[PDB]
Structures are given as C-alpha cells and as structure tokens.
Design a protein around this motif. Structure first.
Motif, PDB file in Angstrom:
ATOM      1  N   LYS D  85       0.712  -1.209   0.063  1.00  0.00           N
ATOM      2  CA  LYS D  85      -0.118  -0.117   0.097  1.00  0.00           C
ATOM      3  C   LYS D  85       0.603   1.340  -0.032  1.00  0.00           C
ATOM      4  O   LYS D  85       0.353   1.990  -0.570  1.00  0.00           O
ATOM      5  N   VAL D  86       1.838   1.260   0.847  1.00  0.00           N
ATOM      6  CA  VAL D  86       2.782   2.376   1.006  1.00  0.00           C
ATOM      7  C   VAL D  86       3.527   2.692  -0.450  1.00  0.00           C
ATOM      8  O   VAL D  86       3.818   3.754  -0.896  1.00  0.00           O
ATOM      9  N   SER D  91       3.829   5.754  -5.722  1.00  0.00           N
ATOM     10  CA  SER D  91       3.846   5.503  -6.959  1.00  0.00           C
ATOM     11  C   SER D  91       2.605   6.623  -7.287  1.00  0.00           C
ATOM     12  O   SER D  91       2.842   7.383  -8.429  1.00  0.00           O
ATOM     13  N   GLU D  92       1.639   6.861  -6.774  1.00  0.00           N
ATOM     14  CA  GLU D  92       0.408   7.580  -7.304  1.00  0.00           C
ATOM     15  C   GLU D  92       0.867   9.232  -6.872  1.00  0.00           C
ATOM     16  O   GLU D  92       0.696   9.901  -7.745  1.00  0.00           O
ATOM     17  N   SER D 127      -4.997   6.487  -1.899  1.00  0.00           N
ATOM     18  CA  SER D 127      -4.150   7.617  -2.436  1.00  0.00           C
ATOM     19  C   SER D 127      -5.053   8.672  -2.784  1.00  0.00           C
ATOM     20  O   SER D 127      -4.735   9.998  -2.386  1.00  0.00           O
ATOM     21  N   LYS D 128      -6.275   8.501  -3.615  1.00  0.00           N
ATOM     22  CA  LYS D 128      -7.293   9.618  -3.804  1.00  0.00           C
ATOM     23  C   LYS D 128      -7.802  10.137  -2.459  1.00  0.00           C
ATOM     24  O   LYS D 128      -7.837  11.393  -2.527  1.00  0.00           O
ATOM     25  N   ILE D 129      -8.190   9.397  -1.672  1.00  0.00           N
ATOM     26  CA  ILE D 129      -8.648   9.859  -0.455  1.00  0.00           C
ATOM     27  C   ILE D 129      -7.722  10.485   0.444  1.00  0.00           C
ATOM     28  O   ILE D 129      -7.829  11.643   1.077  1.00  0.00           O
ATOM     29  N   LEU D 130      -6.479  10.111   0.505  1.00  0.00           N
ATOM     30  CA  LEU D 130      -5.282  10.673   1.176  1.00  0.00           C
ATOM     31  C   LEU D 130      -4.817  11.946   0.547  1.00  0.00           C
ATOM     32  O   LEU D 130      -4.254  12.739   1.297  1.00  0.00           O
ATOM     33  N   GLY D 252     -11.298   7.550 -11.143  1.00  0.00           N
ATOM     34  CA  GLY D 252     -10.170   7.075 -11.665  1.00  0.00           C
ATOM     35  C   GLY D 252      -9.928   5.529 -12.124  1.00  0.00           C
ATOM     36  O   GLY D 252     -11.122   5.251 -12.418  1.00  0.00           O
ATOM     37  N   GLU D 253      -8.631   5.340 -12.309  1.00  0.00           N
ATOM     38  CA  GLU D 253      -8.701   4.040 -13.011  1.00  0.00           C
ATOM     39  C   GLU D 253      -8.303   3.123 -11.715  1.00  0.00           C
ATOM     40  O   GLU D 253      -7.255   3.209 -10.904  1.00  0.00           O
TER      41      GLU D 253
END
Ligand code: GTP
Ligand code: MG
Lengths: 18, 137, 180, 415
Positions: D85-86, D91-92, D127-130, D252-253
């Motif tokens: 996850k990290v 990468s995001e 990543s999107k929420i963070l 997103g994707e």
C-alpha cells in the motif's frame, strides 16, 4: 483509435433476463 | 431495417437447408455494440419474422436456432442468449420476455419434435418467468 | 550504397586471402615458410609454439601460420580453425612410421564441421632423398581422392631447392580466386 | 506488528525512517545491510531478515528496500500488505520511485507516513482519499474516511459521464522442452477508469458460466473463471448471494475484478525452434513460429525472445518476416514483429560463431518467451453483458470498454 483494441460501449444490464 | 430484411431470406434458406435433426478464436467487431436483446427488440424481431414467414411452423433444431441467433447477433449486436426456451416436455416458452416465438410439440423432451409457433401473448405474459421463477431471479 | 571505392581498389588489386601451415614436426614447415617469405633455407629449432608470417605474391597477401607437430601441440590446431580461410598439409615422406600418424592427424583435422571451406593443400616436403615417394603414391596411401567436397592438390616441393613452390602458389591462387 | 518502517537505499543508507512502536532500537538497521550481504552471498537471503530477536521483513523496491523492523510475532502478511500500500501511494503521489524524490519530497513523505499508520496499525491507504488531507503544495479530514465508503469521495462532478473499461487478457503458457504445455493459465483483468458525476453504484453484469447456469442460460458461451477477485468497492455479500456484482466505482482507474481460470485450448502461437549448435564451431537456430490464433486478429508488437549463446559473436539471422536483433545486454535473439496476422508462419535460420575456448562454467538454458499482444481478441470468450450505472440525481452514462489480449507467463522451455 487506440492500440490494444478499440473501446466499445457497454450495456446496462441483461435485458433478456428481465 | 434494410440489412435485416436482406438477411432474413438468406437466414431462412440456410435454416431450411439444415436438417431438423474450423476456425478458433472469438473475434469482435471494432466499435460494434454488444448487449442482450431487449423486450421491445425481441417483440419487433418476432413480428418481423411472423410477417416475413419462414419461422412459424418450421421444425425446431439446434443448428437452425444457432444459425438464427448468430445472424441476429451479426445484424443487431444482440447476444445469442435471449433465444432460450423453457425445458420440456411440452410447450416451451421463450426465456426472454417480449419474444413472440415458442416451441410446441408436432407429434423424453429431447426426442420430442418441436416447431416454432408465433404467440403474441408471450410479449405480454411472462410464461417462462412464471414457470421458472428461480431462473428469472 | 556506393561501391566506387571498392571498384577502384579492385582495379589495382584488393584481395589478399589467408593460408595455414600445419604438419608433423621436422616436416619442413618452418623451412618452407622461411623460403616462401625470405628465400633461404633457415635452420630452426622444433616449433614449440607457432609461427605466423605473410607472403606477398600476385597482389594477394598469402598469410601463412606455421603450426608445429608436437604431441602437446597437435590438439592446439583447433585454435587456428577460427577465422581461417586456407589450409596447407605438409606430409613427411621420409618417416615411414610417422606417415600413419600424419594421415590420422589429417583425417582428424579434416573431420571438423567448422573447417569445411578450407580447400585441401597437400605439400610434398623433403623432396630430396631417394626414399621419397611420387606425387601419387603418397596421395593413394592417404586417400586424398576419398575426401568428398574437398579440393585436394598435391605439390612436391624440395626444401633445399625450392622447386614447385611457384606451381603450388599458382594452384592456391586459382583455387581461392575465381576471376580473371 | 511492525516496530519501525524505514526506507533504505542501494548503498545501505536509510533514506527515511518512521518508528511506529519504538520497541526496537534505531541502530539495528545498520546490521541489516551486512546480514543481507551474507544471506545473498550464501543463498540464504530472504525478504524477511532476523537480527536476533528483531525481524526485518521488507521487499526490494526500484531503488531502495522498504525494510520494516519487528520484534513480536507480528503478521508478516499484514506487513507485506502495508508495504505494498505504501509503494502504491508513493507511485500515485510521485511519478518515480527513486532517491531523487526521497530527499526532495520529505515534507509530504513524513506527513503521509505519520498519517497512514499509528502504533503499527495502518488506518488509511487510499491515495485519492489521502490526497485530500495531506498535500505537498491542511483542512479537516474528508468524511469519506469516516464514512463507510472510503474509496469514492462524495461531491465529484464532471461535465460528462464516461467510464473506460479494459478487458486485458494475460496468456500464460508453460511449455516444456519436450513440446508439451504444463502451466497454461489465463488471468482476466477488468480495469476500469470511472469518471462520472456523484457516487454511482455500478452493477457489473457479464456472461458468467455460473450466472448463466443460475438464470438457466447455461448453454451459450459463458466464461468459467476459476477464481474471481473483486475490488474493495465490490460487495462480497452481493456476489456470494446471487452473483450480483454491485459496487461503487472509484474516481479514476482501478482494478474492479480479476478473473483467473485455466485454459485448455491450443496455444495462439506455436514456436518450432531447433538448436544446431556445433561443438565450439557454430550454431543454428531453425526457429519457426506458427500462429494458432484466429486470422481476424493481429498480434501487435510480437516479441519472441530466443535465448542465444552468451559468448556468441558475429551472428547472422536468416528470417522471413519481422526484424531480428541480438542484444548483448540480454544475451538473446529478440524476434521483434510489428504486425502478426493470425495464422501467419514465420521461419528463421540463425547462424552465429562460438569461441574455440570453452566456457569455465555452465550458463543454463533460459526459457523462450513470446511477447505477443493481439488487441480486440478475447481468448476466454467472456463478453460484458451490462453495467448498471445508477445515480440518485439521475444521468445517462456512456460506459466504454476494450478487450486487449497479450502474452503473460508465455515461456517456452528449451531443450
Ligand atoms: N637437409 C634437409 N633437411 C630438410 C629438408 N626438408 C625438411 N628437412 C628437415 O625438416 C626440418 C624442418 O624444421 P623447421 O623448418 O624448423 O620447421 P618444421 O618443419 O615445422 O619442424 P618443427 O619446428 O619441429 O615443427 C629440418 O630440421 C630438416 O632437418 C630438406 O630439403 N633438406
Ligand atoms: Mg617449423
């Protein structure tokens, strides 16, 4: 166009299954 | 539908030629929409088949049904899964609501001779759904 | 592409070619190479390693790589098989007991799938003693006519005199070069 | 139960460290490098190290190893999931995973590390929420994390409602040197790029074999996926009840579902290769490729990797179609083909030299790998039936999807 196959529209549900 | 009208005679001739009793892969037309046949579309197809003829009273066969489903999918993009009949023995109702075509005995349900018969009540009454509520969800 | 430079170079001579010098020890290989390069019969010690030289004749650089006939150097002939275009076999007609060994070595060297484009070049060395055979008895004993897809040519050269070297060089040039 | 999450480098220097429990001294990282060197030099190197009573379980990234020290009997699977996850979050946020961003993006990296995991227990991984609470260029945390839906931020509005799908096929074939295929598995991949207004509840519908059998249509072309792994948005209970794939697509994707079923069909490409390698003299490569796929499909960018000799030099290739080049970096013949029509047959005749001196040690026989990628070809025959996009406001969606067929673990064992 796009490599790997052109994008195609998708349906909403199984119309033949009600 | 000019294309459907043109393909109807050839499809009927192919079905008649095939008796009642090579290439690998699954190519897909680019940009061709694929979706299950709708109730209105099924009713329109049944009406067109009844008006043009060749489907009402024809001997039901697996090869003829498969050829008809393939032609319908090619000419309209409808998946060949809505042309399903209820299990026998006896009269089999269409699996998809709106279909006006049904199979009736002409004489084990597999060895029973069945023929396609027009039925306008199929598009209004869910005979297949009522007979098999589990199959309809 | 343009090949004008190649044509200009070939108008005055461009092909050089290569050659090999193999055979039994004390077979006149070093003396033959010295005579071909210099023109004198030089006495040298047995070829422990190898001798590399070149001969300029007919506008072709005939590079000859002399190889000794030592027992420990017999299996080292495969090193010269890489990037080799020619091959010269020197027989020892003055050693009856070593004739069989030389024939066996030639057969072993001729049985390689990599050494196929190298045409046969049999040199009759030590052509100064009465015990030396003719140009056909040695070939018949060695069975040079039984080498399928092999262009064999036997030439008798006298180490002390040097006769027949020009004929052998002309034959090698004719076999290598297929032009006017 | 990681004690301290740290990021190392290729020279043994710890780029960044973030202790989570503090039960392990920070000086234990120094012994990790010598321990890793000893394990690698003795063949006992593993991602899970152990410095006495402290375990160093970590994976190797592009440029640094994300080693997370632990002392108790912590869940190794949980640590691996947190590390993955990290890596995904990095990468995001950062387009590159190298030391250039570790020493340049520390201001946001430290905040992300602090917010992601507390006391060794991660809490947020989207990543999107963070990205709405920690930025490198702060308001209250979004209600999506507090709410049940932590993968679809509410209030998203777009001019159009277009969702692009990608039915990516992975043709993995394990053909032995005898010519028989041992491991022939095809793993489906339904990756969709959902871009709509609001929080639509997608209702995915396909021609599944199980779904067709349940509905009573188990007679047409139905995809028999042995393993189906839905994403976090997909409700497990709905799929378990009646095969209902209902989930809220993210913004997103993302990978919604990933089918994985065995394949019992003939290979789409049949490679007939021979090795006429002379004993230190020359070598022959009578490689013939036969396309068993449908003629209507073209394999774009076909790359059949043929492992040539490592010490081979001055090679010559006598092929029919496609450019063949030998790469000394990889030590193999790259059979690169731009367009390969189905049913095509390419014949190649390789010829390269070999040094007279034999090699000191054996080099092995690397498998021959093909890189065929034929788009618009569904080998499994699975076709999307419907996609129920339902929104409270009410809008007409325009979903899109494309089928891409490529070669996955399609390696051919050498003789
Ligand atoms: N007197 C005389 N001796 C010859 C003649 N031809 C060959 N020989 C002998 O052959 C030997 C030739 O040796 P080198 O010229 O040094 O080279 P080589 O033939 O390869 O012999 P190795 O170096 O041992 O392999 C001489 O020592 C001579 O004894 C010849 O025509 N006259
Ligand atoms: Mg000598």
């Amino acid at each position: 166009d796009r490599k790997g196959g052109s994008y195609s529209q998708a349906a909403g549900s199984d119309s033949a299954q009600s | 539908s000019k294309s459907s009208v043109i393909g109807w005679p050839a499809v009927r001739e192919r079905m008649r030629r095939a008796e009642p009793a090579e290439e690998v892969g699954f190519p897909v037309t680019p940009q061709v929409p694929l979706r299950p046949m709708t109730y209105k579309a099924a009713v329109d197809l049944s009406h067109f088949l009844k008006e043009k003829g060749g489907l009402e009273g024809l001997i039901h066969s697996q090869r003829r049904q498969d050829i008809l489903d393939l032609w319908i999918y090619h000419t309209q993009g409808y998946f060949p899964d809505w042309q399903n009949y209820t299990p026998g023995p006896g009269v089999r109702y269409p699996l998809t609501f709106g279909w006006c075509y049904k199979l009736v005995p002409v004489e084990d349900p597999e060895r029973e001779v069945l023929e396609w018969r027009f039925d306008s009540r199929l598009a209004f009454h869910h005979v297949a759904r009522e007979l098999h509520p589990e199959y309809f969800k | 592409g343009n090949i004008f430079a190649n044509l200009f170079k070939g108008l005055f001579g461009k092909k050089e070619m290569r050659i090999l010098m193999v055979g039994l020890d004390a077979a006149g290989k070093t003396t033959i190479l010295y005579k071909l390069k210099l023109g004198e019969i030089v006495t040298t010690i047995p070829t422990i390693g190898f001798n590399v030289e070149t001969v300029e004749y007919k506008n072709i650089s005939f590079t000859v790589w002399d190889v000794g006939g030592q027992d420990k150097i017999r299996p080292l002939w495969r090193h010269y098989f890489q990037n080799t275009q020619g091959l010269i076999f020197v027989v020892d007609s003055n050693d009856r007991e070593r004739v069989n060994e030389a024939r066996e070595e030639l057969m072993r060297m001729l049985a390689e799938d990599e050494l196929r484009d190298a045409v046969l070049l049999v040199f009759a060395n030590k052509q100064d003693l009465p015990n030396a055979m003719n140009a056909a008895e040695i070939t018949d004993k060695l069975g040079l006519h039984s080498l399928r897809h092999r262009n064999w040519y036997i030439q008798a050269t006298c180490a002390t005199s040097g006769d027949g070297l020009y004929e052998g060089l002309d034959w090698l040039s004719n076999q290598l070069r297929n032009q006017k | 139960s990681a004690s301290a999450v740290y990021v190392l480098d290729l020279k043994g220097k710890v780029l960044i460290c973030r202790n989570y429990r503090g039960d392990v001294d920070m000086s234990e990282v120094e012994h990790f490098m010598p321990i890793l060197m000893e394990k690698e030099e003795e063949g006992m190197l593993s991602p899970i190290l152990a410095h006495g009573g402290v375990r160093f379980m970590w994976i190797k990234h592009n440029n640094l190893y994300l080693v997370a020290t632990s002392k108790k009997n912590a869940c190794v699977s949980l640590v691996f999931s947190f590390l993955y996850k990290v890596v995904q979050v990095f990468s995001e946020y950062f387009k590159e995973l190298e030391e250039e961003s570790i020493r340049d993006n520390f201001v946001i990296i430290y905040e992300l590390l602090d917010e992601l995991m507390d006391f060794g227990y991660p809490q947020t991984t989207d990543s999107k929420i963070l990205q709405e609470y920690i930025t490198q260029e702060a308001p209250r945390p979004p209600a999506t994390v507090t709410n049940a839906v932590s993968w679809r931020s509410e209030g998203i509005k777009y001019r159009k409602n277009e969702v692009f799908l990608d039915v990516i096929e992975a043709v993995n074939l394990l053909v032995s040197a005898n010519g028989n295929v041992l491991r022939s598995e095809i793993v489906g991949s339904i990756k969709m790029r959902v871009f709509l207004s609001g929080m639509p509840e997608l209702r995915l519908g396909l021609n599944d074999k199980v779904l067709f059998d349940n509905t009573g249509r188990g007679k047409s072309k139905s995809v028999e996926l042995e393993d189906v792994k839905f994403h976090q948005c997909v409700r497990l209970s709905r799929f378990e009840n009646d095969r209902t794939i209902s989930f809220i697509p993210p913004d997103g994707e993302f990978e919604l579902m990933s089918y994985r079923l065995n394949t019992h069909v003939k290979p789409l490409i049949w490679i007939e290769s021979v090795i006429e390698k002379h004993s230190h003299s020359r070598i022959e490569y009578m490689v013939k490729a036969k396309s068993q796929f449908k003629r209507r499909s073209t394999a774009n960018n076909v790359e059949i990797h043929i492992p040539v000799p490592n010490d081979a030099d001055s090679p010559k290739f006598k092929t029919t179609v496609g450019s063949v080049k030998w790469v000394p970096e990889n030590s193999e013949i790259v059979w690169s083909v731009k367009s390969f029509p189905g049913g095509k047959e390419y014949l190649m005749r390789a010829h390269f030299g070999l040094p007279s001196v034999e090699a000191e040690d054996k080099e092995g026989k690397p498998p021959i790998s093909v890189k065929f990628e034929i788009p618009y070809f569904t080998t499994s025959g699975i076709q999307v039936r419907y996609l129920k996009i339902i929104e409270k406001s009410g809008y007409q969606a325009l979903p899109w999807v494309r089928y891409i067929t490529q070669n996955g673990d399609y390696q051919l064992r050498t003789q």
